[PDB]
Subunit: 103 residues, 6 copies
């Protein structure tokens, strides 16, 4: 059960920047995003914990350079419990299977 | 009915941190989460009341240590009424039945 | 047409506490809850007006003891009009029929 | 087209109070409500314009007397255009046809 | 491709007033409304640009006289691009075809 | 992958103004919009990076000239990753294929 990383920002441009920087910085899979409310958006990624760590640093840096975006909150869980993956939207899916493989 | 615990924070990373810490700290089942609005998220758990208490303390501590997350509100109900379980999203489901058995 | 009681708080933990205290304090049926927006939640109950009054007092007290919850607004209508029950989500349903009977 | 009245408050208890007072005060039909966002709720009524006026005054008074509720905005349109009735949620429906006949 | 006008206010009563004033002031079609979030509502209309201009003035005046309503933002586009009409909800539909004809 | 541009404003009239100015200023395709919450709207465009840049400048100028609208945030990604296009709503669709061909 690979690590999960999650980041949230105000505004969609910021989450787009975060997502592109994250997948290019580490061997990770973007497994989903959330329209969280109040114009906040969440991005969730999976991979080896070191890859998630590097991607997260790059996603934070990308948001901070995006005009009008700000990092609100973020976390990395190295070994998420099966119950967590079953309930929260952080599991894999066929749409992202091509990018799990390369990862 | 087994006890129910509920915790709410601003932001999804905080509820993810709470969820993982809670299920690792006690013999509980995560039965659901809520996108509450205004970027707040709710997590609901079930189990024996002492296990829920231990899990809740671990969930609060996890949120406190998560950047940008704060505990907004929480509660533990030791013996929720059947009408409450039937109307509010705190009941078990097939998706979490493997974790109820392990917990139970 | 039995009385209707409605209470709203900030946060789901508060509405869970209110709902449990209300059904245990009076011979009432919880007929629904609303995700009202802005993290506010509504609970609606039905029963004899005296039972709704007692339940409401217990629901208010429960919210006030819940960490981080606050009562935003509440009302009791003793004899709601049929047009009100038809349009607003305060009618009974099969999911709650078991608890209407005992009530 | 019969007149339309619309009232909005913060919180569902307030719109419940307005709804009951309005239909009891005048020969009107409640045709719908809206979860408007930010915990605001809208109620829309129809009927003869004098009946809508009497109902609106009773709805405002009910909200004023409901704890935690305040009247945010309201309007009465005496003769709404057919294109308005067709696009906005202010038309009658089978669910309220028994109350339109009683009102009419 | 006829002009499009868009107006947004806080509260549904204001958008109802705007919509009625707009269709009565000009030879326009109301093509939709949006629950935009935060209790804001959008109204979108189409027609000859001069008709849209007159309707918009009447919709603004109607909102300003509605108790508790306020104009938040508005725009008129005289000749909207086909790509805009395809993506944004400002095109015609069967529900409003009767009122396009008269217009 | 062609470049992606994204812009966000408060209110729908502002995103309508941005959309029209953007597609008229550059060889771009509008691929979608988002009702982001809190009355904010997002517009997403695709095309060659120089065309996206020209369009973005025109979109910002349009929003600046629209009453009650302000540019809240925007970005341009020259070469978005395939996993980004597959998960976020920035890909082409049949609805806009006539405008992709004209743009391409």
């Amino acid at each position: 059960q690979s690590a999960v990383g999650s980041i949230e920002t105000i505004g969609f441009p910021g989450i787009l920047a975060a997502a592109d920087a994250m997948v290019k910085a580490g061997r990770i899979t973007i497994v989903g995003y959330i329209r969280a409310g109040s114009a906040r958006f969440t991005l969730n990624i999976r991979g080896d914990v070191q890859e998630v760590k590097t991607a997260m640093a790059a996603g934070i840096d990308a948001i901070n350079r995006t005009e009008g975006a700000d990092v609100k909150t973020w976390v990395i869980i190295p070994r998420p419990h099966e119950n967590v993956v079953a309930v929260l939207p952080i599991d894999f899916s066929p749409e992202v299977e091509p990018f799990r493989e390369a990862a």
